[PDB]
């Protein structure tokens, strides 16, 4: 899985997400990466987000559509990503599952070119490239 979202010089957003999925998955298994609203969601009036993690868990929470509606509601890309993760933690616990077994992260971008990211578990990084160059950051 790699997800990528960008704001161009005209100020338009777009995103792409592609994967070979979970290794040794059942035949015919599909994760979050080809699902609009789960692996990727872009609204040019608000912003965009891509997800990382257990495909199943991102589908179950329609993760990336949630992050963008949270930026629509007025959250910064950072705040939207954190609040979206915090909602998913509450759901993992309501399902009596152990958070150590679930990983979901989001990176997000709005129309001003502000960005942000957050995850359930530590250890994921994302790359940011603007006019300060290309850098690896940690959510």
């Amino acid at each position: 899985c790699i997800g990528m979202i960008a704001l161009d010089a005209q100020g338009n957003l777009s995103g792409a997400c592609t994967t070979s999925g979970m290794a040794y998955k059942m035949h015919g298994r599909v994760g979050d990466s080809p699902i609009i609203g789960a692996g990727l969601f872009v609204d040019n009036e608000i912003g965009a987000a891509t997800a990382t993690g257990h495909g199943e868990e991102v589908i179950r929470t329609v993760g990336t559509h949630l992050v963008v509606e949270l930026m629509n509601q007025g959250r910064t890309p950072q705040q939207a990503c954190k609040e979206a993760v915090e909602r998913i933690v509450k759901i993992v616990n309501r399902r009596g599952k152990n958070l150590k077994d679930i990983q979901v992260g989001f990176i997000a971008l709005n129309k001003k070119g502000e960005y942000g990211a957050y995850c359930i578990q530590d250890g994921f990084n994302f790359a940011v490239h603007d006019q300060k160059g290309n850098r690896l950051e940690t959510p």
Partner: protein, 136 residues
């Protein structure tokens, strides 16, 4: 603060260099993100995307991808085999059909009709680890 690209994980740094070749020249974000992720699909040593991707339990490499532009146009393929670049086939679903998502055989039929070439995406390394997992 534009143009700006973000992608997931460490292999995202070098995918971003590729996306930036389009963006620094005033190109479309749609073209930039397609080019960015295609780099990782192309790379056999990138084991979780495209060509080096680890297979399903029956040793079949099946890829999933989707793309979305700045005006709600969307394209998507899932559980498609033998095509190295699922993001371009998803862009073609978006641009060349009345549909938005194609899966399985039907996604490969369409890829081949659009001139995409049939390929073996299971590297020797991935067949090897798969068989090691079948033992375990």
């Amino acid at each position: 603060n534009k143009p700006i690209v973000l992608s997931t994980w460490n292999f995202g740094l070098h995918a971003n260099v590729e996306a930036w070749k389009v963006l620094s020249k005033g190109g479309k974000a749609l073209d930039a993100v397609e080019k960015g992720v295609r780099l990782v699909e192309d790379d056999p040593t990138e084991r979780s995307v495209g060509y080096g991707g680890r297979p399903d339990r029956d040793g079949r490499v099946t890829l999933d991808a989707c793309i979305m532009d700045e005006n709600y146009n969307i394209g998507s393929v899932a559980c498609m085999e033998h095509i190295k670049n699922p993001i371009s086939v998803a862009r073609a679903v978006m641009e060349k059909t009345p549909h938005v998502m194609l899966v399985g055989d039907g996604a490969l039929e369409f890829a081949l009709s659009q001139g995409f070439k049939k390929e073996n995406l299971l590297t020797a390394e991935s067949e090897k680890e798969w068989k090691e997992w079948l033992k375990t």
